[PDB]
């Protein structure tokens, strides 16, 4: 139980959500940016702190 972030992703093709447990929120998108990379997601990276969620939109 370290700190669980979530990535909602609405790309052109891949719409959905994944998750990760991290230290820093800053940590969270470093692996998220990687996860989006691997899946071919490229876009606008916003972020909600009350909800601990990164968004990746195309």
């Amino acid at each position: 139980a370290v700190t669980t972030y979530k990535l909602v992703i609405n790309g052109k093709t891949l719409k959905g959500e994944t998750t990760t447990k991290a230290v820093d929120a800053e940590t969270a998108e470093k692996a998220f940016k990687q996860y989006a990379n691997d899946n071919g997601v490229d876009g606008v990276w916003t972020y909600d702190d009350a909800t601990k969620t990164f968004t990746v939109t195309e």
Binding site: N37, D38, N39, G40
Partner: protein, 213 residues
Amino acid sequence: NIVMTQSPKSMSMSVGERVTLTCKASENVVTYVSWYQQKPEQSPKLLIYGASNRYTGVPDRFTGSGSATDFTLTISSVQAEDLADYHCGQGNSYPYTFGGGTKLEIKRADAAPTVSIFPPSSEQLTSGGASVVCFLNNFYPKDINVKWKIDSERQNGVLNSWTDQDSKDSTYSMSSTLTLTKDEYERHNSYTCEATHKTSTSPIVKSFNRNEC
């Protein structure tokens, strides 16, 4: 601790034929032996309870019998429905034990495959990997050989997979996956999938020379 011993263990039967399954308790369980059916990955369903009662939705083709130590399940007419595993349990006394399961494979007419190859995804490449895939579907006999010849030369970084029999139309399917790097797949160009099956003398063969548009 009662020990439930299931035999044969595996058996293949053409449809409309009879089959018999044996359950053996280590010591008396009177009639407290039930049989469950677990169709290709589904959880188990109750099938026979007591040693001889049919449960909700089992046709009189199924018949269970047995007494203290020896139980048997008789499919009088094997069918495509019946494709599954049959586990047997005794609920006489704790610990409650199951037998090992008996797999029932449907024997049937040979059927040649449908081979499709699919080239790596733009997305796949974005990350620097290239995974080439070929789907050989709905055959019968599960014996098949896929050969991956690169330009028109062959490998080893394949990874194959096989299905359980389709339950309706008693066939199998397969998927071989060739995964090279970006800069590997790259420095190469025609990509083939070759497959002989005893329905064909002549390998079945899947194509594709990289036309990247």
